[model samples]
Target chain A: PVEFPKSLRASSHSSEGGTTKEEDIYGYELLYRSAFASYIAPTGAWNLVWFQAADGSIKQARWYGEWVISTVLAPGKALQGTPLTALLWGPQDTVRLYYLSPQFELQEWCWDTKNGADNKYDGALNAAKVKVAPYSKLGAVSFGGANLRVYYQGTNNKLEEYTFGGGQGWKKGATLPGDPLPGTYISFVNRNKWDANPPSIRGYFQTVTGSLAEQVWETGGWRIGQFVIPAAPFLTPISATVSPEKDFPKIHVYWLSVESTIIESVNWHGWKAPKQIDNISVVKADISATSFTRDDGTVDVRIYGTAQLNVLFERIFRYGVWEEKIHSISVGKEIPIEVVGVAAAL
Target chain B: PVEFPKSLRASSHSSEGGTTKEEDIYGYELLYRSAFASYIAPTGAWNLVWFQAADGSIKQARWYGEWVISTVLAPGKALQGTPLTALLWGPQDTVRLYYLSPQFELQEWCWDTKNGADNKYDGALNAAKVKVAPYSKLGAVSFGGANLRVYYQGTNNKLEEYTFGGGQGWKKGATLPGDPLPGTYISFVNRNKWDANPPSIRGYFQTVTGSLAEQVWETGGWRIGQFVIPAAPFLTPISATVSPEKDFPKIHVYWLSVESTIIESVNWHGWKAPKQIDNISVVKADISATSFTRDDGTVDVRIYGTAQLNVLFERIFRYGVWEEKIHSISVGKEIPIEVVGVAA
Candidate 1:
């Protein structure tokens, strides 16, 4: 286990209660894909980059990460323009990937965390391939303790769900409540029993009616509701997730509001109202949040979004505050920057 | 254990997992009062009516429900215009009422379910009489298992919490996160051990700034966040609650928007984004949602609000769909409708 730095570990308590479970010897894994294989060279297959902190001083990004995986694909057809999602599963906390395949069905690949990085990619399987309806976007969440479920927008514009229990194999293709327009991006948040009440699985989407609608799944059935979006398209909701920070369980959503100038955000708390993020260089882009336990025992929540002019930006919420960082993929703006889902390996 | 109707019971499942717990032999208990004692007669003390399913044919509103409880009152002073809330506690499923007394303090009355409805109201007590801050509105929710907590706006306009565990008794006057306006209505939702995660206690309140704000109590500390409410007073939010329907856990909220027209509702899910209620007929008044197990196996979610032409309307969501029903409190506009806080 990795020990936290003295300064950040004092105010922190161990995960003995049902609060937050911050893993030791854990670092954030940033998974992103660029259209060009290399930034300056720009002459190879569209690469999937895996960036992480190695040891204390060295941080490495495996740009050739996707090519190393064994799978049958026709060139770049297997890679959807949308971002890929990674979820931690099983007792050993295995890292797995969920992405949109060429057929628009759900394709997944898992990594063995018990082994070193050399043998981590020991297995790869395409799960949820039985869905008849094609999906446009994907949202992965954990439910029913040790059970993982995936929600997506079906071809008919309805939200669909698929479940994966430990030994029960997979339960795929169950439509959820509500009629979401095709191509409506969806995000999920679970009220993980802060009280004696049952858990709530809530899905948020930006509908074509210029409103943010939600469908919640509890024990009884699905309840659908919607709230008006202040401004259409500009205030369109993009991505959302509930923060896993101990005692700090907030619904973190990112939106690309404000037309010509900058993108707005609804971070931390308060979804009814949104505040602007001025620290990051770029204003407009789709955003995704990846939270992980940092080396210092403090939890690190990183927000990755496409920056203005083909640049990428990351907003780190740590040290009890949010700090901004930038990753310039292509400085010259020669290629259009369109990166979709972003996830972190556990 | 209660059983559902043959048609509804086949699809029904008990709360063996982390969904909803719908008790058997359920029935909706409707508690309300008219400003006047009678509709046609119209000349007496304010009457508290308890309406429930009786026998197989008749459903009568019990006008004597108020007089049966023991309390200190100056004439009809106990008959305030506020709505009453009932909560369930303990392994025996004891039903208790938390209402505003004549002094506006928290007064509670209990029912011995084991003894039937005849001896149900045998006990009554004032829970939060020591608080100097007289609460105008109240919000109650469960935190730890078998523990129930109540929140109200103190006289200082801050949130105050009073709790009752199985044997811990009542802990009152504990100041909670955020300073809400005096008389501001509040609602609570808890994040329990649903997915091997920590629990979170969240309270939502509408601030004077014309926005909905939330105060969350977790391990780290309390975090307060607020969202703007487009138009001030026009979008004044009123009553809210988290639905206890099986697999249908949603934060249902109601507000009086646009000053007139009808009472607007944001039921279903997402406390963050509330949608307007289009299915219900009227929207110009305050609304309250109460979930109860029906005599049949299904769960009944009733949303009570002032309907069109000042008639009381109940929107029932059950049988896997939503239906609207009207109760004529005042046929003619001779009397007024001043009911608030219709909780269950």
Candidate 2:
């Protein structure tokens, strides 16, 4: 019955059935996550972030600063997401969440339209991207913004943060309270990990300790607000795509990470172990290097494998069990940042 | 085994779990069934049998025929449907099969190639009169030229057929069994029923008690080596479509009929009935109409219905159990037909 505001949405879809297991391959990959703000009080509204062409210019990072606001949007269809949470922008504006499957097809459709409204059109906006996988999940995208903050699901148990201030390049931020994981990056993670269970981040922490509650980001380290983790220890790091939505103010990271299912864990919880945020498998080759998210919310995962067969792949997972368990997320207005399954087999 | 050269191949690559559950609501659907042929026969070695414009004309069909032979062909990759079936054409070839499920891409493959050898650069013969049915389980396809025949599991019990005529045009010597299925005709009473099942088309009167084997055809008063059924038994006739490729002639038709899966009767001899071949659920408003097949081996069986919810559509079906049984028919190439299920 209670309504919730919009933030960020994401999901993924796949065509392969579990029966016929398939090997994953990788190629030039790109990911784009965006959010729309009400633009009411804030001077700037829409913000986009992405890795730019290697210009070697210290001036602007492909994802260094807030690029520019295109236009002020009206409150369209209000939005909502999994857990049946309402994600409308203000009152009427709807929000959508989208993600590209390893196959590069727009498989997932998650939205939070205004309460008591139609979400059909909202799901159809990107129907053309309907494939198990597409060639380039991330098409030609632009990134121009300042201020840098790493929103990542740590591979190692440790919490690591990095920020770029003024003209000073990026510097590693302080570690959180306890020693997090080993590696600074996420090795395995997906949507289910984030929806069901999530590891702690640098600044703030959300978990399923007891009751789910909101935990604010403390300057010193992660501030726990609610309990998030359940019994089982999860795997895989959270993959997040940043957006320049003014509502976020700070870098809005949209990665599949560990999160408590209960509403009480929203602002409260003790950080749990590492949890995978992605579910569906993608093509990843040894030559296929992974791109990291920049301050502007864009990360250009690289590919370095030599042979074509040694392709790079990533997985986009649905929460819980694949059989209609994952919930759709939406942010900005009502756009949920969701993942779609592209084709797997050649 | 002494392999028989294939005459035609067609296939579809869609999924069952989607927002669409289109049953047999079409005149012609595509499929990939038995046989893969690769040969280096002489150019114009065959006359293509395909359909031209709506206006009764063969010129359009003729043009297409000439073009097919002039073009060369060679087998590339084995087809995705049947083994040893390679992609039989080049990028230059106008006709190609595109699979749009895994990746929003297309597969430059050809089922028309008759020989199972490399014919990429050299010209290759294509399957004549091809047809499809949404209701068929092992859809039917018939084609004759290289003296070959093939059959595959269609959407149901229905069959699709295709022959190796030139383009999809009518030629006087277009292999026996003339013309097309009469829009209005009656199924012979004595030839009416088939054993324990409903009689579709009448086979040759090889004997008095039972109808003959072989898919025979009849014209005016002449009966060929194939089978032909009147329209009386069928409520709605299957629609037909004709197209010309190179100099090859092709014809397609579709029809609808209840293929009971289970049957019940006397002693152990009592078997189950045939499974209703309607892809669309028949219980709902989505019921199947009568069936129809074209001279070019094209068959179309229409099923009218709507999706009950999302990917699960409601098709009207005869509520009953069906038994699995083999069909009694002479084997051989007739038509290269394919069946596909739609959501709408």
Candidate 3:
């Protein structure tokens, strides 16, 4: 795949802005050491990568024409080293970040793009005020650009839901029974099916039985679904993305299997068996992925994770195929992130 | 005390640095929301404030002639929202930053001011490899410019010591038996007495029995000492500093009492009863303080802490007396810290 020239980004400053080249070098201090959460402005107007700092505070490396990398969203407001999830509810022009506090209490932060960071607000606690499991992973999605939903492992180890919208406030919803791994991520996609009602949300979880579990949400409610891949889970976080075009939302879910191989499960019409994508000597390293579509039918995918040594690695699928080189960040320019959108993308 | 005009600081850049007036306004990015630890060079060369970011990374706001505020020392290696401690073992030109990892493992990072940030090192794990209690507070002090020691609560709830000195590797030292409150800080000072031999260390702890406990360390070993101030105490962190001049070596320890009043314990020859310093309605808010000595002998002190609203407040003592206005940081610029050096 022809790589995107992220390193060749244009200058974001003018002499009138009083920013020098040396100062410009510092605009990207949003280096992290935890899994990341990222989202893009619908019009490709911005690219924001969110991550937890060692202190469990939240910071985002953002680029909206100009870059504001050191932008801290929530400082010391999350469970130490906990991963977070975020999504944009465009009509509201707001982005919400969800995470768990040190006390495992649910928390959130919001940013309204139209007004910039200064006009941001936050949810001190979900409207429903629910507590999550100690190591519960988070997932958030905005359906129909209005209906918002967030998922986490409830105290009882079930996948719990809290939803927003309908000219209404946030409310606790249903839960799906599953003895999933405590730290297992809640990676789901809207799937934007053609004429589909209630919208389909495909959430992936790693279960205690060492297998992959899928929860399907449709017109009825969430139900235990099927995955074509045989059960051979590694009890770690997973990253998934759906194809563009909103019609036949082909899906790809990535994770590091117990075999120490990067495995990908793709769904054309139905989920396919898992296939080895690449080999990296990493164990229990959380993975994060994102995708973009070109004018053509081909899709671009990116998967990121840390190695056994606490180093970061990015697997890029661009130019219609995966890049042969597993892009491991070099020491001098390295800033570790837990997961989410790619750091180097900014 | 007359306050130090932190807000009225000078410009750090020249136009040649391509710094526009607006760009210079952004240098102090090291603002924090945790308790801060700070140290000064022997020559008062620099004022460096260490703090933990919400992500548990370590950053320092430094002022050496000019300020370089966005200095990050350790990123994402500390226990989340954990308080850290630091001191300049100056002769080595190195400042050691101490804290615990998310796993409660002791960790340290070293910076040699002479060589700048490019030349730095870290102790991934202490030589003794001790694990601290989950809520253990940290304390590090360099004695005799060579003997370095750090204190933390052991998993067994006893105050544990790790000593580093004498071409000798770091060794686990004696434990002080005290039922101190967990999450209570270990604040102590090296009383630089005139002819004192082994020197004296007055370590303060909040006892589980709702009292203040003092541990005195001299040549013999660690001994339970007396606090002139009666034992009514709050099971929170403590911030203490020794006065200037090597002769008498007066001391002051500050903490919020159960009454929610900022209390100060001072010692000229003998420890005096606790005095009410200021009243800010806050509970269990960690405090950090530092002091400077002037040629005339009067002391300068600055104490920082967060209020019940998670807002930052600084109490300054300058000129000779404490300032009347308990300066609360404005919303336009509010950074909270957990405890060591003040943050405003």
Highest DockQ scorer: 3
DockQ of each: 0.01, 0.01, 0.04
CAPRI quality level assigned to candidate 3 from its DockQ score: incorrect
Model 2 residue A37 CA deviation (Å) reads 13
Worst 10 residues of 1 chain A by lDDT: A32-41
Question: How do all models score by TM-score?
Answer: 0.35, 0.23, 0.47
Off by over 4 Å in 2: A1-346, B1-108, B111-116, B120-344
**lDDT tens digits, residues B1-344, model 1?**
11111111111132222112232111111111111110100111222222111110111222232323222122222222332444443323354555554345665555554545434442223644734233245666554444666777665667878777658677773687654544455665554422223446666665543345677776876678443343222123355544344444554445543222223333334435545443222423345554443445445555554442233444556675565333333221122211111100
Candidate that scores best on TM-score: 3
Give per-residue CA lDDT, model 3, range B49-136, as digits (tens): 6765433456666666654546455444666657678766554377788887655688888777665555678763355567776567
Q: DockQ for the candidate 3 complex?
A: 0.04
Report the poorest 10 consecutive residues by lDDT, candidate 2 chain B: B1-10
lDDT of 3 by residue, A1-346 (tens): 1111121211212122221221111101122336677665444455566665433456665656654545455445566667677776553367788877665677788777665545567673455567676557888767765577788887556788888777777788778766665445679777762223467788888665436778888787777887723344324467787756334677888775533457788887766877777543343446677665556655677666554323345567876677877654332222211111111211
**Fraction of the true interface contacts (Cα pairs closer than 8 Å across chains) found in each model:** 0.00, 0.00, 0.06
Flag the better candidate by lDDT, 1 or 2. 1
